[model samples]
Target: LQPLPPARGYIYDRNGVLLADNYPVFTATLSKADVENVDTVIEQLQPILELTQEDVDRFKSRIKTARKTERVAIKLNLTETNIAKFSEVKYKFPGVRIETQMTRYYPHGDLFAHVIGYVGRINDKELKSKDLYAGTNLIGKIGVEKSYEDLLHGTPGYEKDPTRGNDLYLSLDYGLQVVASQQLAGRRGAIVAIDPRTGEILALVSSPSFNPNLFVTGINHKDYSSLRDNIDQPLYNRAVQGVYPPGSTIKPMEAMGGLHYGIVDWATAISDPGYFHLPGDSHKFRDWKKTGHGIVNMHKAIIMSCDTYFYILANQMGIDQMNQWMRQFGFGQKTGVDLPSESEGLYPNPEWKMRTRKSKWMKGETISVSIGQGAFTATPLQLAMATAITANHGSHVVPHVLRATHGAKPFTVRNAPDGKINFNGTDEDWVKMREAMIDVIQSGGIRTPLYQIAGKTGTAQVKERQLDHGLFVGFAPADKPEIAIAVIWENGRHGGSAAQLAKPVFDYWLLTRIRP
Candidate 1:
């Protein structure tokens, strides 16, 4: 008596909308004990089951590794017509039998591709971890599916009797996710939005996404190769894996660093001449503006995104101080979001330069790093997390998708401040910073007439002569931030472009959802 097959868990969004589930399907299995010749069986199945050469080869490969008495599945998810056709020749093929089994299915398709991930047949490498998966033939491949596999998989029993896996409730809002995906369509970019108080991820979107359904059943070679060879890399999860220079979006954190180190005060002023040069080096670091913002205070500098001002500050504080200060805000490091394949991103400093490039740090590099350029790079998730921390005044919670599993509370990961700066800059200091950021949207920096917002715009150059990447990081409602967001558009050319992209997302989440 074979044990019952375990019923896989279902996934639901915060509002209880079903996201992932399983459906019954017909599969053809073969028992080695009853088959006289595998080749004869393959030849018989070719016409009845529409078995291609590749399909026959796949069956042969599986049978070769199975025990003589074991029943192995040769094909799955057969259509009703195909099953009827097979029934006509059932008596001719000795070992073949039709069986019903549950298979993984994603209801939303590409809408939740990056966040929900998909499952596929267990591979040889994964077979080693058989104990973890137990009786299940499918395993989580990426996204929240992979991160919370253990809970969702449950314990497997037997073929006749099965135990059901635990259900998972996510923090994601499906309606909001659709809005995000629609907004980011046709662009090469990523958008990450987080709830500042609970750290629940509202939406994590990566453009050029692929349907997770393609991998649920065995994907055909041509389909798999198409996704693998595509130039846009639809499979790449840009939210946590794509790294790029943050540009002026990093200015707010730099302003905080200056305040912490006493290098600059809210009242401090810098003269921007539209360009900067190192003390002895002749190479000039040009600002976005050919001329400059003239003499500007800290507020004016951030609101206007004066690169020369940060360039001067970067040279004054040097690389060591800047690296140490920025580390507190989670730059150059993984935000520890509960997702896999996260890139730590590069936060280059003196030691990193010497160790990796075997070259000494140059003074000219400081000017670039100061303005979120040089070797500085960060993922969209990291940017969202850092912005959330800043929005909460240095207190941070780990960004996660899993809200609960089977009525059990999920583990909480805290990201408290390092206490070096205490993030305890005076209330007055925070007020000034917050107010300046508010002016960024209101003063034509990145205007949005729907609601008041606080944010910084950035345009990072990908090459000396190529179009720059647009980037923006900010929290909404200015005085009371509930959601923090990060937006990046590859080769967007204008920082304000990112801001324009973020508007609809905010409108959908804050206005439509609340009012409706």
Candidate 2:
């Protein structure tokens, strides 16, 4: 019948690296027991906050004949709001005050906050609903900590076992995660990298991050609101959840769509005259290469990024067939990675267009999607998985965060949104896709020839001038892929710039620090 709880499990990385642990926490206390003046102190203290009758009753019984050195805890955790109020009205009562104690951050300092997640001070309303695990402020609030205990509810907390709960072995590598985070140090963007072979996430970095330590003891109203309203959204986990238009990064699959739907093939050729237009319509959409790339087939189309060719294929294939092909490439869907609030990217379709926008599928719309604009959008996770599938030569790949939970039963196995890809093409069909991407990277002569890196670059056109968002998706040691990555730079004008962002990470993983 008691309402109380205890400790949580430890979280370790793929190689047993854990983020910062045990932190300073806030607790309001009653000094001296304030025998006769206690009720008098509250009437004076009533202005800041109220003490539950239980809150008041527990005081006297707590520290009868208490020492001057001992401070009885009137409350375990203080709301940042309450702290603010109490601080301003300081000196109101010497008998009652606040102090600090060490407890579970049960969290981290920087990089993994949004992933390992944090717990915050439980509030009044939550105190009622959370009675089963009552008397504590910490509870899993976000990231893996959130879905950690299966909505984590009382089952995991109440019988807190006076010790750590089941430990979590994450799929992240701290060094890789750090490298990825440092690369974007001065920027606003995200980078997600995964092993194509195992579907294990090697790195997840979302920029403009905050020290997760703030939320453990409960961030105050002003501080929390500042982050809530901060222009950069320091709290947002861009790596796993942010969705931005995936510009030409969608082309590898667009080219793959051409191969499978029999829309275009090895010998299938189209002449790009710097632009493409519909059969009857006079509207012309310009290709990136204004002078045109003569007669190019699927290989050269992907290698040179022939927009006009793919635009023509989109019109020829129609949205229905293109949608079918993208489903195979994993566009417009969740990649099934175990992160909270993941975006199931929008890959627009005919029914969805009319159902929501009161509009039919337009002819040029499919052309826009062919180039990864228009209604086509993707998350970093989706693009990473799609690139992994392409790296696997179109085999199945699924992303998961929890590699294993120590001493517990097996965690559920996770996979793709529609379960898997449905490509009916031959094995060589995937080679053309992989080979073309390899050429795209070499075409720019990006790195100093560390190894063959296959990649595709994209720029989504933004309406205003923070300019367009830069995007790049690729894999390293292209022949036998190790890691597949996706990078998005906010307000970045060129896709090449984002591709460069992926370069250093490649050097760290494949060249310099090659062990797992």
Candidate 3:
């Protein structure tokens, strides 16, 4: 027989707080061959094992497909009451084994669901792709769980081979992450804060998440159904997967696009009339303010989130130009962060629609893209990447959650440590755009907060009739630019309000707390 590997390493916060570890869990396994009638056996075991009817049904369903060696989990989190009942009935069923198997447990439960993600039973697909998980029951399914699987899942240890590598160290701040989760407080949204200097993710929180403990032994069928069927979708990670219109939060990058394409100068002014109309279409794309922002310059447009100003600018720049420039800013693309299941988002061009939908791109489409509405979609990670890149002024920094090794070693993985703009535009012109963004925080137009802050609010239209998705993108300590953040609240309506929700969290994480 092959020797067992080294024991897995532990997942911890930046300060060495444990997140994922091996724990002894009481598990009940049932053998298919021992039970003459699966239903009778499950029914008799129900009250004692605390197995719900649906749980029995699920176990039976698995029996139909089970192999002789395949052991089906009967119950997880076996209570003392159930344990006593199981011990009483053990002699009656020879195949029943109440065993202690090493199970994955997240002590924080639902608190760090989205941040740490969860481990689940290894499936056929995972087994096919990962050679490391052979004969392993637990797998890190999401968040840091999936991204740093190799690290979080240390080399398995055998009695003969005790020596192993160091533990996996994550950059997540446990205290701050808790604070951020509390701050969100059931809000349906996502918050991402990244250190621009280093790609370490201080905190990444997604609201309406489920506890990882649910799948520790095996999820209860009812609880599993509820989590899977719920409309709020706590199971879905909003940080990387939730797609929403970016709204006016994208204007700063659009303005940068103008200079990059030579379509408009830094100080260029656009005439705003409450609404903009395409040359051939009677449909008037309305601005956020019905009264219009009047004549808005680049700085004013960014501060006020003048939709009309961007509408005209995007029209002048055209859809191809807009998409090309936005791609440079990390729109419609994955941030390449060390996270699993990240959404690339949609950055649409005329040809893109024509090729995919086989429809002709209209002039109005260009106008829509300007305000971060219509075909322009972004994920929390994408928004954060764009904001960080814009904050750096024409340089892209890959957004990442895993900051360093879980141990004392100085480990840093930057998305783009030396990211520079390979596209058009002078460094001096980029500087002008940076100054204007700084002015945005100094003078509150849309994102007005108590502290000096620089950010843009984006109210994106999610549905044709429903309220728009609220989005805010920015970096704090404008002078030093320590932390860059993105806030997205689905159907929140106003981007500025979303910004308010996230501002305090960013401030507390970057300014208040000091750590490695």
Candidate 4:
């Protein structure tokens, strides 16, 4: 039975901005049943379509794989100029004809490439179990398109007419996306912003992105190889798939853990003359500020980003409390965002070390984990999600991208409540931490009278022959949060530098898009 393929679903940003679409392309093909000899067809078509040796060679090879009466394409993606040239000459050839077919199109090019992903021609692996594709030439390769392939690829009609694929509306705010891209361009990093109240992913950006358009019809080996072989890796989705040492961004969580477990209190203080040493160990664990912040309390410790303060908290909190509290923030877990290839992060423990590496967990390692170093890895999605949860004052949200679907049924599901923190915590504990984070931003020289903003800065030291990775996390209108963002800037030198990079995005979103 001959099959008719339908158009794939259209994709749009949250504000109804079109991201993915379909455009018709002209293809020249020869019907085997009507062509006694391809010689005549080739001769006449060569001048009109400007056929290439690669095209003819591929056509010859395809005949072996194609069915008996199928139309074999010799030239595809014909230019408008070439179509008019062949328009009048069709009657002269018996088997040859120009046909039109639809293919995918992405308007913003590389802007949403990593998020929308792209569709590509079916491969030999897909050909074996070809029922889904049937007459459809392309299939979803990655991102939301891959995750929702069944919906994006409409059912094939056995003989004639077909219906279009369901439409998709993403939670991505295009305006915020552009702002993130503008700030992150040429810098190797990722920025993820989510609505603390709804878990809607506002802007997820991984810079050095590739264009999804090239993959639609097909991308040549040269271009794809360049994208793959390049050191900066444009194809990787850093927001969901990349796991990095979370650095000092996690201090807020550790502070919460300390408060909840009663290991520390608001007035509790630590003595720091630039370094700390364990009970019996002679070796010193140093602070980022070699000069030190002198004597510090919980509020001053966070505002100062004192390594000695967290080291003190870690020594007493230990592995059990830290792991338990971190999980509550969605650290070391897949965020369950609607995307493919998400990394399930790691927060190491005694049992895990023994099971996986045949080593007993040591107390010194515990100290490192407290400051989000030494095997405490988290993805950008997890960071943003955790920050959102913190902003919600202990509430939890499953970060998501697909917001709505337009169809006969029209699927629209609200944010699923994963789990929230209820460790018998007092409201005062949250306020204690929130106010400490706000002062960190203000003291760092970022103040907005338009709205209260709370933030934390982090530097991921590479044990330092190479530069450090910079990090920052914050939320706006801190009293009643809207957007919570987390950033990772590779080799950015300082956490304050990343904080500076993150401000313009907040300014654009809070000032331009959302009114005070």
Which segments of model 1 are wrong by more than 4 Å? 31-71, 131-135, 159-161, 407-421, 445-450, 463-466, 514-516
lDDT of 4 by residue, 121-159 (tens): 665565555443544657898988888887777766655
lDDT, residue 106, candidate 3? 70
TM-score of every candidate relative to the true structure: 0.91, 0.83, 0.83, 0.89
In order of listing, the candidates' clash counts read: 9, 0, 11, 0
Candidate with top lDDT is 4
Candidate 2, pairs of clashing residues: none
TM-score of 3: 0.83
Candidate 3 lDDT, 1-516, residue by residue in tens: 232433455677788777777777677877665556666777777888878765676566556655444556677557788888889877987777787767776767676687777777654455446324422556677777777766655454332443332466566787778766766776788888777666567778888878888875567678999999998888988888888878778888888888777777767787788998877778899987888987887778876778888888888888887777789778888878777788889998867788889999878877877877787788887888788777666666777666556433334565445667775778776566666777665666434354556677777765523666778788876656777888887767766678777777776776666221
Give Cα distance to truth, residue 40, candidate 1, Å.
6.4
Cα RMSD for candidate 4?
3.8
Lowest summed lDDT across 10 adjacent residues in model 3 is found at 157-166
List candidate 3 segments past 4 Å from native: 1-6, 27-78, 89-99, 123-135, 156-159, 162-166, 274-294, 406-418, 445-451, 464-466, 514-516
lDDT of 1 by residue, 1-516 (tens): 232446778999888889998998988878677688787877868788877676677667656665565556667789788898988878877678788877898888788889889987655666544433433557788887788776777664544334567788788888888887877898888999988776788889998899898998778889999999998899999898999898888888888888888888888997888899888778889987989998978999988888888988888888898898888777888877787788999889989998898999988878878888889998898888888777877765677887777723244433333333375478667667888989888876455677778888888777422578889888886677778889988778887889888877877888888111
TM-score of candidate 1 to 2 decimals = 0.91
Instruction: Report the number of backbone clashes for model 3.
Output: 11
Clashes of 4: 0
Task: Please list all clashing residue pairs in model 1, or write none if there are none.
Answer: 3-158, 3-159, 3-160, 3-161, 4-158, 4-160, 4-161, 4-162, 5-162
Computed on alpha carbons, the lDDT of every model, listed in order, comes to: 0.79, 0.74, 0.72, 0.82
